[PDB]
């Protein structure tokens, strides 16, 4: 079955407890599966965000449209919708309890994979719909593969190790040079100076 299985919202067990919208699930690197698995290409998420059922449907349609059913195969790398997003009625005073359930969504972090690819095909044969879906996503995406992933990682490592700038970001954050921690965040010390809410700074060290 070299095709993306059908995705549907509202799981078989809709949680009734209205959980609070937490932003920590978007901040930070992709703690979940980051490397490839039983494949060769993937869609590296260069920025946090969200994914709705329509997004998954459009991605599945675009993949099934241009894809060889006897030379490639893709596997889902994101679970089904679950995060309850309670949206109040457009036109009411602030207050009066919490809104009811509206739609589910699967959060995503930076450096997370969405859909994978396999088979004895080159990266150029995928590049098309790869970059297409990447531009469709609601966050900064880009076509990435094993070789290209390793290449960009080595390039980032070389840039970090050869940075002529005697002063870096972590060296100033952890050590607290000029007491700038008052503006910085507690998570910045754990991570690097490349994150900011959800975006990603691949050019910055």
């Amino acid at each position: 079955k070299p095709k993306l299985r059908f995705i549907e919202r509202a799981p078989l067990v809709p949680k009734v407890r209205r959980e609070p919208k937490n932003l920590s699930d978007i901040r930070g690197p992709s703690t979940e599966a980051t490397e490839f698995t039983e494949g060769n290409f993937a869609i590296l998420a260069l920025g946090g965000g969200y994914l709705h059922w329509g997004h998954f449907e459009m991605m599945r349609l675009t993949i099934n449209r241009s894809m060889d059913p006897k030379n490639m195969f893709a596997i889902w790398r994101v679970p089904a919708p679950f995060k309850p997003i309670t949206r109040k009625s457009v036109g009411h005073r602030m207050g009066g309890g919490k809104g009811a359930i509206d739609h589910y969504v699967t959060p995503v972090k930076a450096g997370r994979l969405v859909v994978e690819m396999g088979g004895r095909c080159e990266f150029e044969e995928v590049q098309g719909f790869l970059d297409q879906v990447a531009h469709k996503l609601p966050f900064a995406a880009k076509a990435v593969s094993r070789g290209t992933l390793e290449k960009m990682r080595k390039d980032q490592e070389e840039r970090e190790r050869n940075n002529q700038n005697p002063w870096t970001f972590e060296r100033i954050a952890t050590a607290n040079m000029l007491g700038i921690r008052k503006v910085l965040s507690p998570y910045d010390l754990t991570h690097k100076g490349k994150y900011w809410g959800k975006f990603y700074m691949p050019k910055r060290v």
Binding site: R27, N163, N165, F169, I172, I180, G197, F199, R204
Partner: protein, 158 residues
């Protein structure tokens, strides 16, 4: 405003100053290196074999002939005992200069269909070349000896 936002939140003054001061500074090459300093073996073997078996090889400039014209030429060359050859020039120039054939060096250039042979073909070839409205025979090569079309037709008369 909340921590995470759909748009790019404006960073603090000190935050922006730190981000700008902690920018990446690549190296500065003082000189930059930009301003600093298989099948070919089979081709060579075939060219050497041809040179060793070129008792009466000819050279032309067959290019204006269509596919059907080339087929008709091959049929004519099969009628009277004689074969045709088509090899590159990049791999033939080194062997040309190495075989002491200096007169043939400036000849081979661009397009040229060689016609190797062994048996006498002085009249049939002349007729096959006259049947068309072209005379690309830019001096053949018999027993490794320089000779123009005049000498060729003279030997043919004999």
């Amino acid at each position: 405003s909340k921590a995470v936002t759909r748009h790019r939140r404006v960073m603090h003054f000190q935050r922006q100053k730190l981000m700008a001061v902690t920018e990446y500074i690549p190296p500065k090459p003082a000189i930059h290196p930009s301003c600093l300093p298989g099948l070919i073996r089979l081709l060579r073997r075939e060219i050497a074999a041809v040179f060793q078996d070129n008792r009466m090889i000819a050279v032309c400039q067959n290019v204006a002939l269509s596919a059907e014209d080339k087929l008709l030429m091959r049929h004519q060359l099969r009628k009277h005992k004689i074969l045709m050859k088509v090899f590159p020039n990049q791999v033939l120039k080194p062997f040309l200069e190495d075989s002491k054939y200096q007169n043939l060096l400036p000849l081979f250039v661009g397009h040229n269909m060689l016609l190797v042979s062994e048996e006498p073909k002085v009249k049939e070839m002349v007729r096959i070349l006259r049947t068309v409205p072209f005379l690309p025979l830019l001096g053949g090569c018999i027993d490794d000896t320089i000779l123009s079309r005049q000498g060729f037709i003279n030997y043919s008369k004999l």
